[PDB]
Write a protein that binds this DNA or RNA. Structure first.
Lengths: 82, 82, 79, 73
DNA sequence: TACCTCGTTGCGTTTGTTTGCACGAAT
DNA sequence: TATTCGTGCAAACAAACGCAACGAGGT
């Protein structure tokens, strides 16, 4: 048996993956590549990765048809003259 | 992607894709996912999406923007029916 | 019509634009102290937003405008 | 040209069309104070709108719509 | 002269917004 | 003559940093 993916579990899955990628590369090495101090990469793990992770998880659900039709109408309105 | 690519270029592509996905997701759900006041969400994107995107590029985290093709297609359909 | 929601949309747009440019940077651009931009946000911008709603002076949402630009690029250059 | 002046003219004209009573009601100012309020605040907010490029994005979108129309036609 | 290293944490600095005050204009 | 406003200034707050000390696991 299994349960379907849900957003909070996906956020946890993504946070784990992100933190592991930083650890495998190395915090100082990641800092050097990003262009901030290692103290920033270190602190971001606490201050931003949780937020970044929930945003990425929500984005995994994409756009449902109803919502896409609404966006298309809105954007088409902007791209229609007069 | 094995060569010497400048991560800033992939970072810029990631930023474009994330900004597009967030625009489709909407201000309410975005600001909610990242715990930012909706009245300063443009400011947050200004301040944090570039950093977040550079981080993802460095961690080689893929970011695809497939719903944009879908949106363009549906917008075009609306415009052509005039 | 429903001016209430439009007033709220306009207020959010104004506050978002000021924050994007920056409270201090907006002040410098306008010619007043940064403390005035901070105070205008709290005192008169909400009320001014309802006036703009009644006048039908709202503007395109910046996010949707972004999507419109992206879509136009696709329609123009995608083959 | 001078954007704030352009904005102020259009703004004051639309406000004049709206009238004293409805303008005072919209901003929550007593009718006896609305003329002074406008005299002082519209110039300030017109400047603010110019700075925030109010209306500029809409003007850009109109241009885009015309370009896209030419492609799709 | 607490093994070396490199991620975490203490702090002072840089950059950005709001609050405490008192002044001077308009009435 | 005095009250309400709207301001500029500077300090209080706030957001994020970089540098460098700290200290257990990897060397």
């Amino acid at each position: 048996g299994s349960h379907m993916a849900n957003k909070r579990n996906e956020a946890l899955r993504i946070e784990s993956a992100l933190l592991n990628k930083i650890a495998m590369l190395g915090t100082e090495k990641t800092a050097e590549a990003v262009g901030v101090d290692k103290s920033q990469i270190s602190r971001w793990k606490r201050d931003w990765i949780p937020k970044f992770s929930m945003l990425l998880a929500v984005l995994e659900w994409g756009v449902v048809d109803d919502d896409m039709a609404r966006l298309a109408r809105q954007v088409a309105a902007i791209l229609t003259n007069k």
